[PDB]
Amino acid sequence: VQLVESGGGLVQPGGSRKLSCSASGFAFSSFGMHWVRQAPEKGLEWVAYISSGSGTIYYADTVKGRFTISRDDPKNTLFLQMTSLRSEDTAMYYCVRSIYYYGSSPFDFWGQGTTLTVSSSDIVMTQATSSVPVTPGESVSISCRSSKSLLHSNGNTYLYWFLQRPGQSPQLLIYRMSNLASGVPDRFSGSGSGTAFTLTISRLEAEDVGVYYCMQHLEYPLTFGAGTKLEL
Amino acid sequence: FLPVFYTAVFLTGVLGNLVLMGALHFKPGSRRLIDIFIINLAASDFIFLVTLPLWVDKEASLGLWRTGSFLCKGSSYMISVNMHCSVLLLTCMSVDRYLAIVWPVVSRKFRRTDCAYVVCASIWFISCLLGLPTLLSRELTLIDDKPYCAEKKATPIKLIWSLVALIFTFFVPLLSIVTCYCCIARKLCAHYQQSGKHNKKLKKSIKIIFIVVAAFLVSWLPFNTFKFLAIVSGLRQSAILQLGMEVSGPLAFANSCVNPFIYYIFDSYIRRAIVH
Amino acid sequence: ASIAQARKLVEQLKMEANIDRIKVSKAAADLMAYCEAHAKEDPLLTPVPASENPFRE
Amino acid sequence: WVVPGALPQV
Amino acid sequence: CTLSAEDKAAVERSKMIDRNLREDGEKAAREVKLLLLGAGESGKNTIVKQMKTGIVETHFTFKDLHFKMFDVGAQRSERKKWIHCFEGVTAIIFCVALSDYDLMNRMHESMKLFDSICNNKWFTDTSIILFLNKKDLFEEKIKKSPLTICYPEYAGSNTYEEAAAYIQCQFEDLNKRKDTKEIYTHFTCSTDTKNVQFVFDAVTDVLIKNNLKDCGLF
Amino acid sequence: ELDQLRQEAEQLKNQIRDARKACADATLSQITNNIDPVGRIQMRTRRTLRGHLAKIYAMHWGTDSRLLVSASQDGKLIIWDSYTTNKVHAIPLRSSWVMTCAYAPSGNYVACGGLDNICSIYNLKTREGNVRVSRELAGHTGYLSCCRFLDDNQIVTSSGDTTCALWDIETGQQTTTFTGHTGDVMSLSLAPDTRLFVSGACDASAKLWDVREGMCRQTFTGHESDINAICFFPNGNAFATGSDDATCRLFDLRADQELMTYSHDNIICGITSVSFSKSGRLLLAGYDDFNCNVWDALKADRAGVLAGHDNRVSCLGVTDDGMAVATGSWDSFLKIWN
């Protein structure tokens, strides 16, 4: 499974860039595609979304009317035409895989991303702090709080947990509150009550250090939180 | 003796339409597409015939109405709405058959049972809409102290409306059903020209096409063309014309009364169903 | 030939014959007990309220 | 002001 | 819309599945399906060759018509348990060997199979394209041996035409429903290129008659 | 010698019949007469799963009681979401002649089989995102009917070659072969304890099989036609059969004889699928007369008639929590009744 992306580079303000995301190793036509960006020092921020077989073209509030997103199923490639770049768009965009059948795991695979630098209501969620010290081989609890309740009438708490290794793309751990991902160690666990969510790690290891992100998926503008960096 | 037939056409039509509706609504299994048109046309003909014997009693007493004005209005409205509905439903049957015979692959996707119900409901609603002019124009009139289920004379705007509602409700349906069944017959005859040992069963289908066309034309064309001549004469300005009106008025019921026998003797799926 | 299949059928029927059989009364009573124990938890014979029903619209 | 033959005539 | 993002995208996925599923269903209904039945390899292999473990599906096209031949015979099981799987097939290609009257008799077993298939609960509406294979070998056998051995009640003679006509007529007489279904008999042998054309013409008649019965015009 | 073997064989069969007759003292009806019936139960079509375009031959529920898979005449295997009308998956088949489908207890796999004499295992949860066939199983010489996942790695398959097979997925090899039926074997059911499974065949007999041993532990008769359906009681000590003779019978494992004969004079069409309720009180039975019938299993009456479909009900299933029952007929619709 590959989601290699191309594009990026220094762009004059008000310019245009044509991001590409060359999928490989999976049925790209049946996967919803997202774009997620992070500032060179800040946390993750959702960009846009295109569903399987085009259709839904949801954007974010800060990008509406720009950043038109398109997909080409026969070539298994994903694009993001960029219009009127500002100094606030300097971020490293992620081509995020997603699928939305019952029991699926959205946001499984994230591309390596391409850096982009430009020369000079919705649910809000925050985490406990910007850094949490912890020794290896010890259990720590990572907490994220939400304004609106993420628990829906269907009974699914659309809370997401992502772990970003230093220098690596985010890797999903808990796609729905208290529901573990695939390919991640069993030590990771999630829990919550509807507004306050805490993640238990159960005697973390050396590779578990990084930045943790909490994302809702209830109201479609997806909001991340100030990442909780873990001291090694 | 037109009544001598009014009650005669009333009976055969009621019995045939009732047995057809019972057979094709009580038959277990999948309900096919054409059977929706069959059953709606059967109900339309049943209610076209149910109000007939009151008019039989009316015409029997030298055209003297007996009941109240409520029946005078209601029977006229039902007869008019059912007259429009039968022709429109026959047109939709003809276009359905043309689609399913000449274009059996491309038109399959443009064909659903729910779509058939939608088209039938639209036809019924538009027939009710066209029946309102008759209801508002109909009123029982007292002449010489004889209760008469007569008309409110005529006005040129009413004649213009009647001309347009004659053309775009019979003649366009006539030129639709005739061309559809003509194309069906042409395709079947072209298949017949291939011949061979088989393909001689297609003669039955050609006969069915021709008998449907012949029945519809013989039943409707004379009265409606006489009505068109009457309207164009009233607009642009008659004993025979009127004589044509009372000698072809009974003839319009033949198409309504003949169809159940047509599907009883010249069909297969309906055949077995009625058998039950 | 058919001798081998006859022998195998005879052996299967023999090992079938000697199995332990318990009175039908107590097996039927056990079916009764299982049915009456889970009658409350059976949501088809007892009409489940629409509150905890997952299939109502 | 005429009575038709059980049919919307004219 | 009282629905979450996940369930809305699930609905979109289901709608995509429905559209492509209906496309596949339309493409499957557009093509014509044929069922093959011989009586002990009485011509199935040669009729597949002429027209180009489990059951075998043969796909071929003639004059813009996609045919699918479901050759059963390797099943070697109860036909009553899977013969309803083929209900709704367009036509049944039934193959018998003409040079089997002398060879119980093979022809009588062929008649038993034909009677079982034609007079079936499922294959009432479906027409049957009967095939009479190996007519040259039957020429030789008739020139060498009389046909009366197979048919005790025969009023014919050594002539080919009357014997073939009698066999054909015996095959049509096995049908108890001559109005719901009709049999498209044909005489053919090896290296005969007209047999695929017979199948195409017969199936075109079957399709037109089926469409006309759906319209209530037949 | 053949005759001297067969005479003592039929003598041994008579001995078994005598042992069964002596062991039976009071029928299930005599002691079930004390309790009151469940009464009339009028289930309704909560959901109608449309989307097939051909005749549906099998279905299987999930262990989560929300997902189910259906196999139809067209080469399509659809996985539904019963709480909605959504189609989670819709995967094509190599052979459109599919007569069965099974949904793995873990939910990771779904099986199908039919006239191709092959059981195809499909891996639902793959990183590729689509569904890929994983070790389609060959070795049966007849049409395969009513495959069932023993676990993620072992599947038991029945075929119309008078044999049942147990497989290993990684090395598809029909490890244990269950031979002894005379006619084609139509349906099989797995006991809840996951140790024994019973199969009904066209020889008008049902045999209880030992999965680990591979021997025919028990055999059952009584039906006079082809047994088209079979299903274990929820406790694992009994099972119910459905045959072409329009009768359902309730056997049991601890004894060797029947308990009920769920038949009605007005019913002359055979059974295609049989299912049990969570408590085992309700015996769902899919019939050939275009509708399913609900039977009080302890009694011998008809609690209700599942509403008639457009065609013969070919498949039937009850959720592991018993919260709903799903049917699929020879039309292209599945209906969930609650």
Author numbering:
A (entry chain S): 2 to 121, 124 to 235
B (entry chain R): 35 to 271, 277 to 315
C (entry chain C): 7 to 63
D (entry chain L): 72 to 81
E (entry chain A): 3 to 54, 182 to 232, 240 to 354
F (entry chain B): 3 to 340
What does the article say, verbatim?
The atypical chemoattractant receptor GPR15, a class-A GPCR, is significantly involved in colorectal cancer pathogenesis and the maintenance of intestinal immune homeostasis. Specifically, the 11 amino acids at the C-terminus of GPR15L (GPR15LC11) have been shown to exhibit potent efficacy in activating GPR155.
To this end, we present the Cryo-EM structure of the GPR15–Gi complex bound to GPR15LC11 at 2.9 Å resolution. The peptide adopts a “V” shape and occupies a transmembrane pocket, formed by residues from transmembrane (TM) segments TM1/2, TM3/4, TM5/6/7, and the second extracellular loop (ECL2) in the extracellular side of GPR15. The main chain of G76 of the “GAL” motif forms a hydrogen bond with Y401.39 in the receptor. The functional assay shows that K2616.55A and Y401.39A mutations completely abolished ligand-induced receptor activation, suggesting that this hydrogen bonding interaction plays a key role in receptor recognition. In the “WVVP” motif, interactions with the receptor include the main chain of V73 and W82 forming hydrogen bonds with E185ECL2, stabilizing the conformation of the ligand and the extracellular portion of the receptor. The binding of GPR15LC11 engages in a hydrophobic interaction with F2576.51 of GPR15, inducing its downward shift. Accordingly, F2576.51A mutation profoundly reduces the activation of GPR15. This conformational change is accompanied by a downward rotational movement of toggle switch residue W2546.48.
